[PDB]
Design a protein around this ligand. Structure first.
Ligand SMILES: CC(C)(COP(=O)(O)OP(=O)(O)OC[C@H]1O[C@@H](n2cnc3c(N)ncnc32)[C@H](O)[C@@H]1OP(=O)(O)O)[C@@H](O)C(=O)NCCC(=O)NCCS
Ligand SMILES: CC(C)(COP(=O)(O)OP(=O)(O)OC[C@H]1O[C@@H](n2cnc3c(N)ncnc32)[C@H](O)[C@@H]1OP(=O)(O)O)[C@@H](O)C(=O)NCCC(=O)NCCS
Ligand SMILES: NC[C@@H]1O[C@H](O[C@H]2[C@@H](O)[C@H](O[C@@H]3[C@@H](O)[C@H](N)C[C@H](N)[C@H]3O[C@H]3O[C@H](CO)[C@@H](O)[C@H](O)[C@H]3N)O[C@@H]2CO)[C@H](N)[C@@H](O)[C@@H]1O
Ligand SMILES: NC[C@@H]1O[C@H](O[C@H]2[C@@H](O)[C@H](O[C@@H]3[C@@H](O)[C@H](N)C[C@H](N)[C@H]3O[C@H]3O[C@H](CO)[C@@H](O)[C@H](O)[C@H]3N)O[C@@H]2CO)[C@H](N)[C@@H](O)[C@@H]1O
Ligand SMILES: [Ca+2]
Ligand SMILES: [Ca+2]
Ligand SMILES: [Ca+2]
Lengths: 187, 187
């Protein structure tokens, strides 16, 4: 039931409608920040509206995830990173979230080497059920002034969906995995 | 000439193979490598067709460009990076290149803070004409194991299109600009 739209083609009221719905959906200090919204921009949005109202949203945005295999090689994987997955609270538990992820996984499978996200510890079983793989190793970020810095807080949160890895590569989820730099939450 | 815009994930197999075949030839060790094709995926494609065959391609993919302002604050700018802009040999100088860049710039203005690209020499006038800023400072890449490494080869090639810079950001082309890491040509 989800409509796929590039940030590009969102009119002002859809952007404001989506942002307002996502900010409210992540309230149980505003949990969903300006940086969190920046992270949701530049890729494909999955939207579900009912009678003029936005009731569901998700985004998949491109970045690189860094992974070194046991042959020592080093890979910068073309990643579809899942952001701002949200359903208006009264509309939850009726398959809308599923419909949003169904549409984002179509993007990921069609365009990227790997899907990734850092799930709220509440949503973790929903991803595990879709066949997303929990990372077991240490997580880190490639910083511009320090080098690769550990992100222990994101170790339990990181999920991957390896859709089309290069060469022979099969990930070992016990190895380290490193995200590229951005402001706010790196994961 | 009007380009149609399509996400990587919506390309049918024949159009994907068609685009890569046309782009490899337009750039003709082949000059257009497997990494070069990798770099053109994950974003929006501009396509122009004629007599059932592709005559023009380009792509805009999301990455981060790192820039430090005169107030010492580091920015990780949401970048629409332009890749694989190509017009079939027999169709050059009819404005097809212009139509491709018009559609990609629609994406960049609609979704990103900055546009960037590392132009071949033959393409340079086309960018200078469209009002892309030539960079005058040193360029670098953020590497995983060596920190920020100068990319002197790319100093003369870099164009940016600054469309929606964060508050308090004066883009000075004399200063250093750093791309995020990827395999192959970092720029
Ligand atoms: C997480 C969220 C998007 C789920 O959306 P939803 O429309 O309730 O979910 P669905 O009905 O499609 O179900 C998602 C899965 O969660 C579980 N689930 C079952 N009932 C549920 C309910 N009422 N609410 C949430 N999850 C439920 C099931 O495993 C379900 O899979 P199913 O469709 O096979 O039953 C939504 O609750 C939300 O917006 N939460 C707050 C913001 C947030 O945490 N989202 C992103 C975290 S990474
Ligand atoms: C993309 C490419 C075909 C240029 O496309 P094109 O169809 O020749 O370009 P257009 O006709 O749209 O315009 C090219 C520009 O050349 C310039 N130009 C126009 N007439 C010219 C002339 N007589 N002499 C020289 N330059 C001229 C103009 O700036 C023109 O833009 P405009 O027509 O909007 O004014 C060329 O870059 C290419 O395909 N080469 C191989 C692949 C490649 O190197 N691409 C690199 C992208 S970085
Ligand atoms: N008052 C409600 C709050 O909800 C919060 O909900 C969760 C989310 O806000 C956030 O979830 C993860 C986080 O686990 C992980 N370590 C970092 C990751 N970037 C966050 O990401 C998630 O939430 C943010 C919005 O905050 C979204 O931008 C992002 O797309 C989404 N996947 O962190 C929280 C998980 O600890 C918290 N559980 C807690 O602060 C509190 O219960
Ligand atoms: N060597 C001079 C000329 O190089 C041309 O080819 C150029 C392009 O192939 C390539 O241009 C730039 C490059 O300058 C810069 N330092 C790095 C950047 N990634 C390259 O990028 C460009 O070409 C590659 C394809 O190779 C594309 O994938 C990319 O999208 C495109 N903008 O590098 C070459 C140097 O400018 C032509 N083969 C020919 O006119 C002539 O040989
Ligand atoms: Ca947050
Ligand atoms: Ca090349
Ligand atoms: Ca080959």
């Amino acid at each position: 039931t989800a409509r796929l739209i590039h940030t590009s083609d969102l009119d002002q009221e859809t952007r404001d409608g989506a942002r307002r719905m996502v900010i409210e959906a992540f309230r149980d200090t505003d949990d969903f920040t300006d940086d969190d919204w920046d992270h949701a921009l530049g890729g494909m949005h999955a939207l579900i509206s009912h009678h003029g109202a936005l009731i569901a949203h998700g985004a998949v945005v491109q970045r690189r995830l860094m992974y070194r295999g046991p042959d020592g090689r080093g890979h910068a994987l073309r990643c579809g990173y899942v952001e701002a997955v949200a359903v208006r609270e009264d509309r939850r538990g009726d398959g809308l979230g599923t419909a949003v992820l169904d549409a984002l996984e179509q993007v990921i499978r069609g365009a990227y080497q790997i899907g990734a996200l850092s799930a709220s510890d509440i949503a973790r079983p929903m991803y595990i059920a879709r066949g997303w793989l929990s990372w077991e190793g240490p997580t880190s970020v490639l910083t511009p002034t320090e080098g690769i810095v550990r992100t222990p807080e994101d170790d339990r949160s990181l999920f991957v969906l390896p859709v089309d890895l290069p060469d022979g590569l099969e990930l070992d989820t016990a190895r380290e995995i490193t995200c590229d730099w951005r402001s706010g939450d790196p994961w």
